[PDB]
UniProtKB/Swiss-Prot annotation:
It comes from Homo sapiens (Human). Belongs to the protein kinase superfamily. Tyr protein kinase family. SRC subfamily. This is Proto-oncogene tyrosine-protein kinase Src. Expressed ubiquitously. Expressed in the skin (at protein level). Platelets, neurons and osteoclasts express 5-fold to 200-fold higher levels than most other tissues. The chain holds residues 264 to 536 of 536 of the full protein. The SH2 and SH3 domains are important for the intramolecular and intermolecular interactions that regulate catalytic activity, localization, and substrate recruitment.
Amino acid sequence: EIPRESLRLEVKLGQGEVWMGTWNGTTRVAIKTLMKKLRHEKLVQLYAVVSEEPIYIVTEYMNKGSLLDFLKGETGKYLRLPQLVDMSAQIASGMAYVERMNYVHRDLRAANILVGENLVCKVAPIKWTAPEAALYGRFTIKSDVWSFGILLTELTTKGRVPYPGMVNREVLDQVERGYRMPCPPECPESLHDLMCQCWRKEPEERPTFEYLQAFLEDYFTSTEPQYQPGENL
């Protein structure tokens, strides 16, 4: 809870609205116009609120915008697998916290991850949604794991929409018949194997975020120690 005059609203980032600005003329902040329980290094941090109208919400500033906009921007073409797996390992870590706190995110995808400097990533759509959630409304941490498998394809394709060429109904139809996205060009099969574990039909058989985090943190020693950079990954 803070004074209204203590927030200088500078650049409008999107549409209520979202602004870049300064708090107490020193701290760069993100400002939402018309999360106290959750505290983790890989979750975007709430700084302050103004509870009465007009309502203002103040969070740490993530200077590269969404992961989605980062991968699709000027820097994305330079990202290679090591940086993309490192990003996914940070997302898995934030989701491991959510998982331990008995929460469920429900809209996990690159549009909803924010990126800072030093490639720091923090957690803040039928194609991203598990079949049991999309169809029967069973949203669990395991349906978030499914969304994470999909998010891994966004990372390995540097930000492409999943199920390229398919409309929502075709995706829902095909996935119901066992379809899964193939291995992305130049993505190691071991990483696609991980995707395929996240997309197991039985939700309880999908891995935990704690497991995902460990697999991705360790990836270039334990799983791909012979990794050589290619044309794009």
